[PDB]
UniProtKB/Swiss-Prot annotation, chain A:
It comes from Escherichia coli (strain K12). Induction: Induced by BasR. Bifunctional enzyme that catalyzes the oxidative decarboxylation of UDP-glucuronic acid (UDP-GlcUA) to UDP-4-keto-arabinose (UDP-Ara4O) and the addition of a formyl group to UDP-4-amino-4-deoxy-L-arabinose (UDP-L-Ara4N) to form UDP-L-4-formamido-arabinose (UDP-L-Ara4FN). The modified arabinose is attached to lipid A and is required for resistance to polymyxin and cationic antimicrobial peptides. This is Bifunctional polymyxin resistance protein ArnA. UDP-alpha-D-glucuronate binds at residues 20, 52, 86-95, 173. Residues 1-216 are annotated as: Dehydrogenase ArnADH. Homohexamer, formed by a dimer of trimers. Changing residue 179 to M: 400-fold lower activity. The chain holds residues 441 to 656 of 660 of the full protein.
UniProtKB/Swiss-Prot annotation, chain C:
This is Bifunctional polymyxin resistance protein ArnA. In the N-terminal section; belongs to the Fmt family. UDP-L-Ara4N formyltransferase subfamily. It comes from the Bacteria. The gene is arnA. It comes from Escherichia coli (strain K12). The lineage of its organism: Bacteria, Pseudomonadati, Pseudomonadota, Gammaproteobacteria, Enterobacterales. Homohexamer, formed by a dimer of trimers. Bifunctional enzyme that catalyzes the oxidative decarboxylation of UDP-glucuronic acid (UDP-GlcUA) to UDP-4-keto-arabinose (UDP-Ara4O) and the addition of a formyl group to UDP-4-amino-4-deoxy-L-arabinose (UDP-L-Ara4N) to form UDP-L-4-formamido-arabinose (UDP-L-Ara4FN). The modified arabinose is attached to lipid A and is required for resistance to polymyxin and cationic antimicrobial peptides. Induction: Induced by BasR.
Amino acid sequence: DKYFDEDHSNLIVGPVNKPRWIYSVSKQLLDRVIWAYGEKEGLQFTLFRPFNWMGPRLDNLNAARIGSSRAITQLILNLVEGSPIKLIDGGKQKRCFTDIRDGIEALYRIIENAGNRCDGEIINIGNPENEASIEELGEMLLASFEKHPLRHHFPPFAGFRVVESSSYYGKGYQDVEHRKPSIRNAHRCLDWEPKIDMQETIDETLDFFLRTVDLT
Amino acid sequence: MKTVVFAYHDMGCLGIEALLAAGYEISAIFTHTDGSVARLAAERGIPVYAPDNVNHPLWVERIAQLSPDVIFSFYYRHLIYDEILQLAPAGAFNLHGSLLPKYRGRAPLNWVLVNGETETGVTLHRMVKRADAGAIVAQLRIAIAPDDIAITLHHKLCHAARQLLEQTLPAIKHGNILEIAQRENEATCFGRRTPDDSFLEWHKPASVLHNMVRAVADPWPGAFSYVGNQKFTVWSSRVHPHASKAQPGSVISVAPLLIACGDGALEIVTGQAGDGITMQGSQLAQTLGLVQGSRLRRTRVLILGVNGFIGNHLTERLLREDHYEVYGLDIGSDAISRFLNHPHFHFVEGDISIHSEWIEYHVKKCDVVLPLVAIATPIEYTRNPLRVFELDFEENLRIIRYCVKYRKRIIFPSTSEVYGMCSDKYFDEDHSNLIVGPVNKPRWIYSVSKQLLDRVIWAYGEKEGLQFTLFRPFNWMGPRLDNLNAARIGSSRAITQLILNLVEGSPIKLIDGGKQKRCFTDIRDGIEALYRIIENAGNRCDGEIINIGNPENEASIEELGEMLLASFEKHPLRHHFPPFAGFRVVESSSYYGKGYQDVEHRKPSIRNAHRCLDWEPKIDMQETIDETLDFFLRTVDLT
Amino acid sequence: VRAVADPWPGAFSYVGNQKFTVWSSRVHPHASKAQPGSVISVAPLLIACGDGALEIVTGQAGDGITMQGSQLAQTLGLVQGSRLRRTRVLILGVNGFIGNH
Amino acid sequence: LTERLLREDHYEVYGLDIGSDAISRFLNHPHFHFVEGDISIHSEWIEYHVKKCDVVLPLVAIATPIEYTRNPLRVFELDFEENLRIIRYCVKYRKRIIFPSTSEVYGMCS
Ligand SMILES: O=C(O)[C@H]1O[C@H](OP(=O)(O)OP(=O)(O)OC[C@H]2O[C@@H](n3ccc(=O)[nH]c3=O)[C@H](O)[C@@H]2O)[C@H](O)[C@@H](O)[C@@H]1O
Ligand SMILES: O=C(O)[C@H]1O[C@H](OP(=O)(O)OP(=O)(O)OC[C@H]2O[C@@H](n3ccc(=O)[nH]c3=O)[C@H](O)[C@@H]2O)[C@H](O)[C@@H](O)[C@@H]1O
Ligand SMILES: Nc1ncnc2c1ncn2[C@@H]1O[C@H](COP(=O)(O)OP(=O)(O)OP(=O)(O)O)[C@@H](O)[C@H]1O
Ligand SMILES: Nc1ncnc2c1ncn2[C@@H]1O[C@H](COP(=O)(O)OP(=O)(O)OP(=O)(O)O)[C@@H](O)[C@H]1O
């Protein structure tokens, strides 16, 4: 679907021989169990689905050294250590990046649960307006990095390089070509609307992490 | 000219060199990881690559970029195929180590020694769809000395190749070559030799055996035999026409170590006991304990939920064979009571959530575990999602873990429902994507639960060596598929539910029109395939996921209903039951409740089954309908 | 690199997290105000040392195949840029004779 | 020992073991009560019988030297831990225990 809908979209994962979906399927089974408990035992719940939230503290440069971090924070490690930014399978796949500030605001509203409008609700939280390919993310990041005050402390850019997903994630990786959320439920239950634009999130994030590097 | 080379090992280096000295421009070299072809390429400043599959689009695209005139293959191990081969206008030639069309298979250097040929050679032929079949561009004979061994002949061939290329390579560079086609009715082919192919069978002639030790002498693995439980390797042999009334395999003497063969005797000049160091025969004789004397229970299957539809039928099948011992536990026992007197059947009435001592002890004791305990009647997915989750998922995950703990083989029953509303014409175990609906459509809790289990078993296999085989049944049906009683609560699969309708005189409802279809498989077909999986011939089922269904028996629920009705009307017992109340379309919600969603079509790919089991469904649907109907009608008490 | 050249394990270094091995070297008295460890050029692959530069003639990134330096430079992502908490002790019975001391 | 005890009339023999080929000949004996079990799994039976019987002879072990070096931990767990559990059932239910020590306990005594 053009818009992943909490109440109508179908869920699609790959073959069992594509273990990257173990996470997806695990989280889905939990959503279903919570749902059953809600229906069959009165559990009061609210499920929220973040859409590529990013900003300061999204992982750390150190974990990124092992690939154990999300894209944005990983690419920052690249610029920092002077290694090239690899675009898994061309990096043409896109995502909708959401500023952590927007995300936390929506979540806050959910905790507030004004009018109990969130009970039994499944709510996506993302900014459908910040859709961008990983390649574009890499460029925007690079642009900011070049203008940054601390730039001169790090090595010269080693450039962008297309890489086979297998050589980064190992055998059994498969990915999502596009991901955009429907934010109707969020609007209906929280009267919420994402506001911060992607570029601003990129700047915030980059700054935080660059000032994380000990220079000496 | 300009070329792209695919080389490896020795032939690879002489090939690249010959090519260089001949004035060719090498755009790139493709080789493998581990004289090193890479080092050479590196030393010459020729871009070298080692992908696992050069046939991949990216590479094909990149190789095309280089725009090569001709392609050469000098002992490249992976297989280069058409797609890329035809990118070279001048063609693609390969250098094979035999006098084609003879020994066109692989491992010719060894095979020719095995069969004791008197000569061999190198052939540079064109690459065509068929392996080593292409028109010959040049060939060159080599005499195999009586005292030649794999390694010494290897150099012989290398030297020959260096000479053949040296002169026929400049020829190709222009256009002076004749594609002398191959005499197809003379070609011989051989396959990969495994170290088990170098086993010595003393009943054969000393000549034969002697060629064996030569064929695979050091640096190759070598010819081996056994002294009781002990395995030793013969590195140096020596045929003795010196007869010996001694029976083949017996030791004629220990100095020299002379073994009696079917024809003449073989002298073991040097060899090694086990992974020991090499030593002279006389010493090897001692370290093996030789003197003048000759050289060289049933499977326990654990079935949990043995009284079930799959369970009882599988038990019947296994009990037929003699090499099986069946251990089973279940809440009920009416389906397996007929086996209680069988010596190889050990049943016990238990609950997977209570009787731990027995269950664990038996996973620990048996050889294969088949956890068939579950709830697989759709109505229950929406009606009792949590009971399904706990039994189908949690209870089984516990058994899966007993299996990894005691390193046992587990043949876990997956489901065709794991594919969900997949859109492929054929649901493929290794390629189809899995599609389910929203969380507000609880019918998928079963599908998703079984899928997570498949994935966990898969991780245990990959990360912890668990030996497994997942099998997915596609609407299997036949006698005992549920029971008329459970059907009174909707707790049964379609076929058995519709029979209850005919029996009680209530209408057959077609959920949402009943236009959705399924591929119905006869339980006899299913059990046969499963049996094969237990047999696991050649271990061809390890780590495999196998669908089991008859793609030929596709039918809509409406058609199933008609076929059933037709049989029912012709059944001898018909007059005992009320008049047909007719078919009636019904909203799924009024039968399954809120949150139901279904599969519009389900057909399996049965390739894997064919490949791993050499299995193929046989029984046609109508026959299954009859069987099933008859069983259940004769279940009804008439009085 | 000579001392442990093939068939020996070989001399190695790191490009960030990546480890690579130098099989063929070549000293260049050719100065370079470049600080030691930084890449002077990628063709030939010339690394600035404490005294003079070292040219990596052939090497391999990780466990990959050997290749000429220029190519090794690319496969490592090199351009003109530089190459290459406290311990927690748990004491149970810490108040004891050995422990407190 | 079972053969020996089964000869006398004043004995009732209860036994558990992984195997049963050596004692199958006694399965028909009225005074012999055998059950195929594992000391590390079948607790209900083991505890109930230490509680029910008069003397306990914990003969489960691994006593083939190669195993001491080859599988030291398996030896430790079975020979020591599993048995320490039986010893304790005995003190819990105040039962007589005829424990099988070993000449190997003397080691290289002089
Ligand atoms: O916050 C989100 O919505 C989701 O973020 C991640 O999943 P994903 O976005 O697929 O993966 P990232 O690691 O964030 O990177 C996105 C894509 O960029 C690409 N990428 C990443 C890293 C890199 O160095 N290069 C590169 O091209 C990969 O194809 C990767 O899948 C998490 O795995 C999800 O649990 C989470 O819900
Ligand atoms: O053996 C199979 O492969 C699968 O069978 C069942 O799932 P399913 O085939 O969807 O459901 P059935 O109860 O067998 O009936 C098939 C369809 O017939 C229709 N039906 C059923 C009953 C009835 O009275 N009327 C009717 O129209 C329903 O739409 C139903 O989904 C099980 O739920 C799966 O776990 C199993 O893998
Ligand atoms: N808690 C339990 N303990 C032991 N056995 C159980 C338990 N719950 C269910 N079972 C058993 O599981 C058995 C197998 O289930 P059933 O025959 O209904 O389906 P199935 O043969 O797996 O069907 P399909 O092959 O269509 O999935 C039942 O006969 C039942 O006795
Ligand atoms: N159950 C327990 N839980 C926690 N600490 C304990 C317990 N039993 C004893 N201890 C501690 O262990 C500490 C260490 O023992 P202690 O100082 O007597 O000897 P030690 O320093 O080990 O002597 P040596 O070095 O001569 O063997 C004691 O100070 C005591 O507090």
